[PDB]
Design a protein around this ligand. Structure first.
Ligand SMILES: *Cc1ccc(-n2c(-c3cccnc3)nc3ccccc32)cc1Br
Lengths: 7, 230
C-alpha cells in the first residue's frame, strides 16, 4: 500500500 | 458520554498528556469528549483530534492487514476469519465514531476554509478506511462517499488556499492515494500528485523559512509516491 500523510 | 463531567479545557490538557504518554486510545476519548462540548475547535485542537484517531485507526488497520494476509494464505478452522472480523468491526466502529463527530456537528459549523477543508479531508480519509475493508452491497457507496468528501475539500482548497498550504497539500496527497489504492485510477493519482507538486514549487518563493520547511516536507511525500508509482 502507498503512504498517505503521516502523523 | 463518559467525558461529560470533565471541563473542556481539562479534556484538551489531558489529550496533550496522553499524546506525550503515547496513550492514543485515551487521547481519542479525551478529544471526542472535547468535541461533544459543542464548541468549534481551534487549529491546534483539530490537529489533536486528527493525531489521536489516526494513531488508533492506524494500529487497527495494520492488524487487519496482518490478519487478512494470513486468512488469504489459509484459502483450517474458523478462528482466523473470526478474529479478522473482530478487528474489522472494531475498526469500523472507530471510523463510524469519527464520521459521527464530523456530521454532528463539526462540518456544518465550519465556515473558514482551513477548518472546513480539514474536516472534509478527514471525512474522505475515514470513508477511505471503511472502503479498504468493504466487500458487501454498500462498497460502491462507501467509495463514492470518500470521493465526494475529498472533491468538496479540493474545490474549496483550490478557491481559498495557496498551492503551498499544508492542508491543501496533505489533502492532495491523500486524495491521490485514494485514486491509486481505492478507485483503481493510477493515472488520476499520478496527475494529481504531479500537478500539486508543480503548483506548490512555483509558490515556494512567497514563503517564510518556517512555512517553506512545512510545505517542502509534504511535497517530498508527493514526490516519494510519484517515484513509487512510476
Ligand atoms: C491533513 C493534514 C495536512 C497538513 C497538516 N499539517 C499542518 C497544518 C497546518 C495548518 C493547519 N493544520 C495543519 N502543518 C504541517 C506541517 C508538516 C506536516 C503536516 C502539516 C496536518 C494534517 Br492532519
Amino acid at each position: 500500500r502507498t503512504p498517505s500523510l503521516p502523523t | 458520554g463518559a467525558m461529560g463531567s470533565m471541563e473542556r479545557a481539562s479534556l484538551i490538557q489531558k489529550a496533550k498528556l496522553a499524546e506525550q504518554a503515547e496513550r492514543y486510545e485515551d487521547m481519542a476519548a479525551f478529544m471526542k469528549g472535547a468535541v461533544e462540548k459543542g464548541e468549534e475547535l481551534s487549529c491546534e485542537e483539530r490537529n489533536l483530534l486528527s493525531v489521536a484517531y489516526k494513531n488508533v485507526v492506524g494500529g487497527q488497520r495494520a492488524a487487519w492487514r496482518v490478519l487478512s494476509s494470513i486468512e488469504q494464505k489459509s484459502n483450517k478452522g474458523p478462528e482466523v476469519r473470526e478474529y479478522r472480523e473482530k478487528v474489522e468491526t472494531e475498526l469500523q466502529g472507530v471510523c463510524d465514531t469519527v464520521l459521527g463527530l464530523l456530521d454532528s456537528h463539526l462540518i456544518k459549523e465550519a465556515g473558514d476554509a482551513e477548518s472546513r477543508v480539514f474536516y472534509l479531508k478527514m471525512k474522505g480519509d475515514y470513508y477511505r478506511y471503511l472502503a479498504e475493508v468493504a466487500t458487501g452491497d454498500d462498497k460502491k457507496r462507501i467509495i463514492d462517499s470518500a470521493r465526494s468528501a475529498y472533491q468538496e475539500a479540493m474545490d474549496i482548497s483550490k478557491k481559498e488556499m495557496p498551492p503551498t498550504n499544508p492542508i491543501r497539500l496533505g489533502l492532495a496527497l491523500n486524495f491521490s492515494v485514494f485514486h491509486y489504492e481505492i478507485a483503481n485510477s493510477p493515472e488520476e493519482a499520478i496527475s494529481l500528485a504531479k500537478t500539486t507538486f508543480d503548483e506548490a514549487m512555483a509558490d515556494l518563493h512567497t514563503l517564510s523559512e518556517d512555512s517553506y520547511k512545512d510545505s517542502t516536507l509534504i511535497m517530498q511525500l508527493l514526490r516519494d509516491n510519484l517515484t513509487l508509482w512510476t
